[PDB]
Amino acid sequence: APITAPDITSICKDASSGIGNQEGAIRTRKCCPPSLGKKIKDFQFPNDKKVRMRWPAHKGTKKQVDDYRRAIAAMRALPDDDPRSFVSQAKIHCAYCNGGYTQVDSGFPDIDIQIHNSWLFFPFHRWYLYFYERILGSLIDEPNFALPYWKWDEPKGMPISNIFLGDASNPLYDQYRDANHIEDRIVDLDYDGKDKDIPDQQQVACNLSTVYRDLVRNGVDPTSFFGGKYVAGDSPVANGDPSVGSVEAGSHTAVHRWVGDPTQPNNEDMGNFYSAGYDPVFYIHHANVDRMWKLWKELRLPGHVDITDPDWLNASYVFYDENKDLVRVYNKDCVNLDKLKYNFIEN
Amino acid sequence: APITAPDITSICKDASSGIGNQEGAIRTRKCCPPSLGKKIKDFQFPNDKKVRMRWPAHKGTKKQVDDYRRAIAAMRALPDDDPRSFVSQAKIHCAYCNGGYTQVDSGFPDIDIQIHNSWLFFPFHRWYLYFYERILGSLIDEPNFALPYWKWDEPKGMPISNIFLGDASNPLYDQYRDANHIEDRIVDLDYDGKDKDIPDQQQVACNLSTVYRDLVRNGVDPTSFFGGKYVAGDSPVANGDPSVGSVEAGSHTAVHRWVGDPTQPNNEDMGNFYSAGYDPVFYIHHANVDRMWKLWKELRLPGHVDITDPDWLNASYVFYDENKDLVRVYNKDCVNLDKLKYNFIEN
């Protein structure tokens, strides 16, 4: 049976999983979404006239950067318990990644839902970003608003974009980043807890190698790329489990570890799932992770196919949308970017 | 039906295929092996007490280097018509690659045998080096003699090794190499006939990328790694054919082109099959190509298995061995390195 999110507004508990120092935690664990008297409705494919074109974060136009910055400002200015707010959007990640929900609807009220460390990883975050993007656009009345994406697979895109830097006057800034690494600028997609002492050009090549590893060498079929099978009745797969898919375990994990501030108790913000969403760059890193799924399929190598297992196809989550409506979304419906009305600007 | 070499001492003709400028050729086209009145014996697996451990050319012990150099000197000192002589060993490549033999033993006396550009590539060169290596060891009384291999998949092994340089006093030297490239030292495994003009470190990273391309991205199954099916009655597959396997067409071809001297009429020596064997580095390049077969299997990826088609297994060649006996060898019998009593020193 497929993993099925419950009525997240009725069955939810404070996050208590996968956070090593909770007494010292600098972000809240009260990650449950607000109740607004809404009924959960099924997703319907969007009627957008145009496809939203996500843009490399190092090559944005003035309008792209300004709109993104203004949308994040608007999101930050919302009351916290507005489901569209900066805090609410961060909390989504916390609730789904750190034990807010159970498998009660599947007959396992005693087992939490975890969307990481399995084949749920790619489609959960695709949907998370889908609504996030639509919410941001709605806040600035831009019906074709598109996220930037951190193109760390392209040399010039590897430095964290200066749009995220500066101080708190910049809505895209977050003080809770590794200061040494921000100074270094170039992300280490192979970061394993110790700084490489290598030339920038070598790090660029290392990052290129890492993308090759995640997309070709280790991602040779759906199990190894998307991650292991995870169905109702299954306990949560541990961080670092070898059954985790290549991108999730690889480049994905590295960027989180590298940006997260090691002086913080749980390496907040990016260094733990529960806090990662308080860093605006979280979503923009994840936009390129989302793109990796696209690229992986474009390679047209043996085994580079989407999942057809019904227990994956029919897995579902619940999100607030830009209308503060509750939407149930299914893995099967996010495999086709054209139907979700967004894509990525390529070379 | 399998490709089957004839009695090479009875049916043989001068090489006249694949050589663009025959009249200006700086090496011989009369590549037929000598006649000593020997019968052709069936292969017997070797009873070597120790496994021959082929050593990276850039990190040999003093004994490894001195033994190799002395063995080549001894090989160059042999009478020309000794089938073990330097030129006789070079001629083997010429005969099997440039039209010395026909498929007479298969009932096709007017069709040439070609061992390149097909699934015969790897096993033919494996056997060729097997006897070459045993011959060298026998000339200096080193029963456990092993060849070096040009480890151009490892950064410090990418420069052509100093042991091949100097001038005519060095048995390992060959004047017919691209002087500009010998100056550059670092081989370009992605060489397409145009110098890249990039930083050494970049070329190193490119070479590593090229190895992953040949072994993982393009060598996805036996057809794409080993090359196309080639059986009795087939005409020679043309250089550049899309059916050529990934290593043969990729890194393998690149090293030949890069080392070969473009000021020579057929880019002798390494730049044409018929002359490649006059460059000692030919065999040492090919020892690493041989190693790629091993590595490709060790990747433990779907499709990375040996050929089971009888028309490949039962294909055979004839070589002189270290005792000047004629030996017929089959593809099926070279798939296991333990049984051939050699391997490669790894990190």
Binding site: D153, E154, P155, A205, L208, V211, Y212, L215, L295, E298, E346, N347 | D190, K196, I198, Q202, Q203, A205, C206, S209, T210
Partner: peptide, 8 residues
Amino acid sequence: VFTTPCDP
């Protein structure tokens, strides 16, 4: 398609 160090 992704970038490799062999490419211009």
